[PDB]
């Protein structure tokens, strides 16, 4: 379970993370290289290598990632808003191949988004 | 139906857009101010003002937005990947209050994502 990436070990709790939320479907923790005052990730416990590999049945799960993201943002006091990001492949900047949702806030986010 | 924002009119087809996909749940069209070679949006036909206002029942719908996004990206030939973005409120850069998913590709996306 969890797969064989950095996030797989985090899921199996082999290596700790700053976990801020956990249910039977996903886990959320602070990003080790924050790009904003608040920057955490929300990942599914199910191993999906990347958004392009997600299937139609994974819709609820993917939406669950955003719902959890809005809740955690709320717990962390992000009243002025935030930005959610999902990277896919080389051009997307994906380096860990386990789907993850970035949630950034605590400052004005710029445009373009990279 | 569709709400009363710019996207509401697009949904009701009162004002045209470069529609690239449409089903009973959502619509996808090219962004009028592209930040990358390929830059389109995926929006739900249901009016949700912003991600923070989405409810638990909207999970499948939100995930559907990403599934459609990966499909459209595929149709548009984005083999090297892409980045999906959802902005929330002031800090997120949201200016149109109807949930929308940005999908950017065609070039290397940078970090931080704004
Ligand atoms: C956007 C770049 N590429 S990425 O889209 O693949 O996102 C991966 C993110 O996970 C990260 N990461 C790697 N190891 C850990 C860890 N132990 N805890 C938290 N985050 C981690 C990086 O900080 C990075 O922001
Ligand atoms: C990221 C900034 N803020 S935003 O997160 O709110 O995204 C809104 C996006 O919808 C846009 N937009 C407004 N009118 C139209 C239209 N008729 N067709 C396509 N896109 C439109 C802008 O280009 C913008 O990129």
Curated annotation (Swiss-Prot), chains A, B:
Gene3D superfamilies: HIT-like. The keyword Transcription applies. Its EC number is 3.9.1.-, 3.4.22.-. GO terms for cellular component: cytoplasm; histone deacetylase complex; nucleus. InterPro entries: Histidine_triad_CS, Histidine_triad_HIT, HIT-like, HIT-like_sf. Changing residue 26 to A: No effect on its ability to convert adenosine 5'-O-phosphorothioate into 5'-O-monophosphate. It is found in: Cytoplasm; Nucleus. A motif (Histidine triad motif) lies at residues 98-102. The modification N6-acetyllysine is found at residues 9, 18. GO terms for biological process: intrinsic apoptotic signaling pathway by p53 class mediator; protein desumoylation; proteolysis; purine ribonucleotide catabolic process; regulation of DNA-templated transcription. It catalyses: adenosine 5'-phosphoramidate + H2O = AMP + NH4(+). Widely expressed. The modification Phosphoserine is found at residues 33, 60. AMP binds at residues 31-32, 87, 93-95, 100-102. The active site is at residue 100. One of its GO terms (molecular function) is adenosine 5'-monophosphoramidase activity. It comes from the Eukaryota. It holds the Pfam family HIT. Residues 6-114 form the HIT domain. The keyword tRNA-binding does not apply. Keywords: Acetylation, Apoptosis, Cytoplasm, Hydrolase, Nucleotide-binding, Nucleus, Phosphoprotein, Protease, Thiol protease, Transcription, Transcription regulation, Ubl conjugation pathway. PROSITE patterns: HIT_1, HIT_2. Homodimer. Interacts with CDK7. Interacts with RUVBL1 and RUVBL2 and is associated with the LEF1/TCF1-CTNNB1 complex and with a KAT5 histone acetyltransferase complex. Identified in a complex with MITF and CTNNB1. Interacts with CDC34 and RBX1, and is part of a SCF (SKP2-CUL1-F-box protein) E3 ubiquitin-protein ligase complex. Interacts with SUMO1, SUMO2 and RGS17. Interacts with the Ten-1 ICD form of TENM1. Interacts with CALM1; interaction increases in the presence of calcium ions. Exhibits adenosine 5'-monophosphoramidase activity, hydrolyzing purine nucleotide phosphoramidates with a single phosphate group such as adenosine 5'monophosphoramidate (AMP-NH2) to yield AMP and NH2. Hydrolyzes adenosine 5'monophosphomorpholidate (AMP-morpholidate) and guanosine 5'monophosphomorpholidate (GMP-morpholidate). Hydrolyzes lysyl-AMP (AMP-N-epsilon-(N-alpha-acetyl lysine methyl ester)) generated by lysine tRNA ligase. Hydrolyzes Met-AMP, His-AMP, Asp-AMP, lysyl-GMP (GMP-N-epsilon-(N-alpha-acetyl lysine methyl ester)) and AMP-N-alanine methyl ester. Belongs to the HINT family. This is Adenosine 5'-monophosphoramidase HINT1. It comes from Oryctolagus cuniculus (Rabbit). The lineage of its organism: Eukaryota, Metazoa, Chordata, Craniata, Vertebrata.
